Curated annotation (Swiss-Prot), chain B:
The gene is S. Glycans are attached at N35. It comes from Severe acute respiratory syndrome coronavirus 2 (2019-nCoV). This is Spike protein S1. Binds to host ACE2. RBD also interacts with the N-linked glycan on 'Asn-90' of ACE2. Cleavage of S generates a polybasic C-terminal sequence on S1 that binds to host Neuropilin-1 (NRP1) and Neuropilin-2 (NRP2) receptors. Interacts with host integrin alpha-5/beta-1 (ITGA5:ITGB1) and with ACE2 in complex with integrin alpha-5/beta-1 (ITGA5:ITGB1). May interact via cytoplasmic c-terminus with M protein. May interact (via N-terminus) with host bilirubin and biliverdin, thereby preventing antibody binding to the SARS-CoV-2 spike NTD via an allosteric mechanism. Attaches the virion to the cell membrane by interacting with host receptor, initiating the infection. The major receptor is host ACE2. When S2/S2' has been cleaved, binding to the receptor triggers direct fusion at the cell membrane. When S2/S2' has not been cleaved, binding to the receptor results in internalization of the virus by endocytosis using host TFRC and GRM2 and leading to fusion of the virion membrane with the host endosomal membrane. Alternatively, may use NRP1/NRP2 and integrin as entry receptors. The chain holds residues 27 to 62 of 1273 of the full protein. The lineage of its organism: Viruses, Riboviria, Orthornavirae, Pisuviricota, Pisoniviricetes.
From Swiss-Prot, chain C:
Subunit of the fusion protein that is processed upon entry into the host cell. Mediates fusion of the virion and cellular membranes by functioning as a class I viral fusion protein. Contains a viral fusion peptide that is unmasked after S2 cleavage. This cleavage can occur at the cell membrane by host TMPRSS2 or during endocytosis by host CSTL. In either case, this triggers an extensive and irreversible conformational change that leads to fusion of the viral envelope with the cellular cytoplasmic membrane, releasing viral genomic RNA into the host cell cytoplasm. The chain holds residues 831 to 878 of 1273 of the full protein. Residues 5-25 are annotated as: Fusion peptide 2. It comes from Severe acute respiratory syndrome coronavirus 2. Disulfide bonds join C10-C21. This is Spike protein S2'. The gene is S. Residues 1-23 are annotated as: Disordered.
Length: 288, 36, 48, 96
C-alpha cells in the first residue's frame, strides 16, 4: 500500500509458492550400449598405416568407463570436455584403433606433423574427438620382435585426414621401373616397428583409439549415457523427463497410452501425464 | 489406371498422445479423394 | 466446480486433458464468486 | 495391416498408419522402385523360361503433399476421422 495506515479490507500482499524439494535428471534406459569392449579390450590391433575403423552408432555410448579407468596412460579430448561426453551426443562416431610407438603417441592430435600425422594417420585441424591410448608391452611385444605393425615411408603426396592407405605395391622412388619388385630406387612402401618387451617406454607398442565424433545436421545416433534418479510420487518435485522439464506432483494415472506414444497433451497444448522412460507407467501432471 | 483413394493415407503426425481433442497440423499427407 | 483438485493426480503429459489443472499450472487462477450459487438462489427465491 | 474382401480398388474406409520404424539413414533419395516375387510350384520346371507366377496382387501409389488436416483424436488416442480442409468449401470451414 505504501502507507503506514491501512483501511479495513482484504489486500493482496504477495504470492504463495511451494518450492521444489529436489532435482531429478533423467535419460532413457541404459541398454543398447555401443560395443566399446570390442575396441578397447580387443584381442588384436591394426597397424598404423591401415587402422581399423569401427563406426559406432545407434546406441547410448557410455564414455564414463573409459574416462574413469586407470588402465589408460592418457585420455585427451580436444573438441569437447572429456567430462561432457556423457551429456553430449554425436551424429556419428568413428573409432580408429591402431598400434604405434610410444614416442609417436603425441602425434595423434590435431595440428600435428610427423611420420604418422603426415603419411600414416592424419587428423583434421578442427578435429573433434578424443584420443585414448595405453601401453601394450605385455600383449604386443615379442622377444623376437613384433614386425606385424607397419607405417609408411614414401608416398606420392601427403595424406589427408583420416585417409588410410593399405596398398602393398612397391613404391618407385626413381625412374627405373619397379615392375612390382624392389631394386634400385624401388622400395616396399612400409617399414615395420621392432617392438620388444625389453625396450624402453617410448619403444613400447601402445594401443591408441581415437573416437572422432562427426557432427552433422543429420539425426544423432550416438548419444551419452543416462544419469537417472529414483521416481518419487505425490510430491511437488522438479522433474526432467526425456525431452521436457517442469514442476508438479507425479501421480499414478488411469490413462492408456499407445505403445509408441511418449507424452500426452492438454487440449490447450500443455504437458499433462508422461510415460516414464524406465518403467512403462503413465504419470499424470499437476502443478504444485 | 487410376483409382480414388477416398479417405486413406492418414498417419499419426507425431508420437504425442492426445485425447478427445481436434488437433490441426500441416504435414505431408495423401490428399483426400486424390488420384492414385 | 468443487475448487479442489488432487495435486498428485495431476503430474506429467494427460492432466492438461484436464484444462483447469493446466491453467493451474501457468499462474492462471480462478477466484470463486463471493455469492455462492446456493446463496444466489436464495435471493432469487426472495425476490420472487 | 487389415483383412479385407476388397475390390481391386481400395476399400473405402478410414484407418491410421502407426509408425513402425525410424531410420537414421540420412541419404537423399530421389526415386524408388517396388520389388515383386515369383511363385513357382512343384509342377513348374525351375527354369526362368516360363515357370513362374507373379500372383494376383496389385498396388497403388499416390504422392503426399503439404496440406493442412484436422485430426480427430478418440478417447483412446486413436484417430477416427480427418478433414482435408484443402478439399472442399465445406472442408475449408471445418478447419477454421
Amino acid at each position: 500500500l505504501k502507507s503506514f495506515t491501512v483501511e479495513k479490507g482484504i489486500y493482496q500482499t504477495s504470492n504463495f509458492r511451494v518450492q521444489p524439494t529436489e532435482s531429478i535428471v533423467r535419460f532413457p534406459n541404459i541398454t543398447n550400449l555401443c560395443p566399446f569392449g570390442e575396441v578397447f579390450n580387443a584381442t588384436r590391433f591394426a597397424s598404423v598405416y591401415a587402422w581399423n575403423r569401427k563406426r559406432i552408432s545407434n546406441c547410448v555410448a557410455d564414455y564414463s568407463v573409459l574416462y574413469n579407468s586407470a588402465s589408460f596412460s592418457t585420455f585427451k579430448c580436444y573438441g569437447v570436455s572429456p567430462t561432457k561426453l556423457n551429456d553430449l551426443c554425436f551424429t556419428n562416431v568413428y573409432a580408429d584403433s591402431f598400434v604405434i610407438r610410444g614416442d609417436e603417441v603425441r602425434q595423434i592430435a590435431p595440428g600435428q606433423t610427423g611420420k604418422i600425422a603426415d603419411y600414416n594417420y592424419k587428423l583434421p585441424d578442427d578435429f573433434t574427438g578424443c584420443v585414448i591410448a595405453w601401453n601394450s608391452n605385455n600383449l604386443d611385444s615379442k622377444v623376437g620382435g613384433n614386425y606385424n605393425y607397419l607405417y609408411r615411408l614414401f608416398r606420392k603426396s601427403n595424406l589427408k585426414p583420416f585417409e588410410r592407405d593399405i596398398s602393398t605395391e612397391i613404391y618407385q622412388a626413381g625412374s627405373t621401373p619397379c615392375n612390382g619388385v624392389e631394386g634400385f630406387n624401388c622400395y616396399f612402401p612400409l617399414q615395420s616397428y621392432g617392438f620388444q618387451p625389453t625396450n624402453g617406454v617410448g619403444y613400447q607398442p601402445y594401443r591408441v583409439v581415437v573416437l572422432s565424433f562427426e557432427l552433422l545436421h543429420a539425426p544423432a545416433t550416438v548419444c551419452g549415457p543416462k544419469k537417472s534418479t529414483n521416481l518419487v510420487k505425490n510430491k511437488c518435485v522438479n522433474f526432467n523427463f526425456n525431452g521436457l522439464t517442469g514442476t508438479g506432483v507425479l501421480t499414478e494415472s488411469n490413462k492408456k497410452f499407445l505403445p509408441f506414444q511418449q507424452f500426452g497433451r492438454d487440449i490447450a497444448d500443455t504437458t499433462d501425464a508422461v510415460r516414464d522412460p524406465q518403467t512403462l507407467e503413465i504419470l499424470d501432471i499437476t502443478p504444485c | 489406371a487410376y483409382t480414388n483413394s477416398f479417405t486413406r493415407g492418414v498417419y499419426y503426425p507425431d508420437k504425442v498422445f492426445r485425447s478427445s481433442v481436434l488437433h490441426s497440423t500441416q504435414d505431408l499427407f495423401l490428399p483426400f479423394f486424390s488420384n492414385v | 466446480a468443487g475448487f479442489i483438485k488432487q495435486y498428485g493426480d495431476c503430474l506429467g503429459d494427460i492432466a492438461a486433458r484436464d484444462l483447469i489443472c493446466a491453467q493451474k499450472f501457468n499462474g492462471l487462477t480462478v477466484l470463486p464468486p463471493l455469492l455462492t450459487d446456493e446463496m444466489i438462489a436464495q435471493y432469487t427465491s426472495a425476490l420472487l | 495391416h487389415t483383412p479385407i474382401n476388397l475390390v481391386r480398388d481400395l476399400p473405402q474406409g478410414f484407418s491410421a498408419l502407426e509408425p513402425l520404424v525410424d531410420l537414421p539413414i540420412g541419404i537423399n533419395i530421389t526415386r524408388f522402385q517396388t520389388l515383386l516375387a515369383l511363385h513357382r510350384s512343384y509342377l513348374t520346371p525351375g527354369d526362368s523360361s516360363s515357370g513362374w507366377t507373379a500372383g494376383a496382387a496389385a498396388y497403388y501409389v499416390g504422392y503426399l503433399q503439404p496440406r493442412t488436416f484436422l485430426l480427430k483424436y478418440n478417447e483412446n488416442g486413436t484417430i477416427t476421422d480427418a478433414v482435408d480442409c484443402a478439399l472442399d468449401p465445406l472442408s475449408e470451414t471445418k478447419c477454421t
